[PDB]
């Protein structure tokens, strides 16, 4: 399965106890447009489009 791009709807917060993981709710840019929550590394903001390698895996809500 090719990776599917998803755009950030809400930047939920900073995790990993070092803040480096960013929690973001991402809505698939194309397709069913499911809104899943995924961990992100680096600088991220609303409307950032990132290719999700599997997308069937989601981080704990707001954790």
């Amino acid at each position: 399965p090719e990776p599917i791009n998803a755009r950030v709807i809400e930047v939920l917060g900073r995790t990993s106890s070092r803040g480096g993981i960013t929690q973001v709710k991402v809505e698939f840019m194309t397709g069913e447009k499911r809104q899943i929550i995924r961990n992100v590394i680096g600088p991220v903001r609303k409307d950032d489009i990132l290719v999700l390698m599997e997308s069937e895996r989601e981080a704990r809500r707001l954790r």
Partner: protein, 184 residues
């Protein structure tokens, strides 16, 4: 605007709609020496000519710290050596190289007690790692060889743009992504 008085930005559009926003050719100025403060503001870095970011990545290791004038000279000669072989716009071949060199998955602990989990690399980090990897593969390649920095930089860009694993940057992307798939 013709970078190095030779190459336009008109056809240089990034195909990757996930990475197109963070790569900018609009602010290009002949000679990538804009002294604009990229350090200021969290995302001002994104609004910078891609070629200038490469010229900032080239000057590393300390012995070569700060010499932008010498780095941009290399970028021009490297672009000529990309034009000479690829036969395409070298600003556009760099744009494809930055897009490919950036991995989309990394491994970080994620509040675990050493157990890393899978994360998603941000679309700015993908651009920052991609350029850094291009320059660092060349840096290692030219350390003790008759081959000049300009030649190896020209070849990593030419190899990344297609996706050949000979590129130190693409090997790094595939290693980072694969560790991320297992730690998933």
């Amino acid at each position: 605007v013709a970078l190095f008085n030779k190459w336009p930005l008109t056809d240089v559009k990034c195909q990757d709609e996930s990475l197109e926003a963070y790569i900018s050719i609009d602010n290009h100025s002949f000679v990538p020496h804009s002294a604009g403060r990229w350090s200021a503001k969290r995302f001002r870095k994104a609004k910078c000519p891609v070629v200038e970011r490469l010229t900032n990545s080239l000057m590393m290791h300390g012995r070569n710290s700060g010499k932008k004038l010498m780095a941009m000279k290399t970028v021009g000669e490297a672009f000529e050596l990309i034009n000479l072989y690829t036969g395409k716009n070298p600003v556009q071949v760099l744009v494809d190289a930055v897009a490919n060199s950036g991995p989309r998955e990394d491994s970080c602990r994620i509040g675990k007690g050493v157990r890393r989990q899978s994360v998603d690399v941000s679309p700015l980090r993908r651009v920052n790692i991609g350029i850094y990897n291009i320059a660092t593969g060349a840096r290692k390649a030219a350390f003790r060889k008759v081959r000049p920095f300009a030649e190896c930089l020209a070849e990593e860009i030419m190899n990344a743009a297609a996706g050949a694993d000979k590129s130190y940057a693409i090997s790094q992307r595939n290693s980072v992504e694969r560790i991320a798939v297992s730690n998933r």
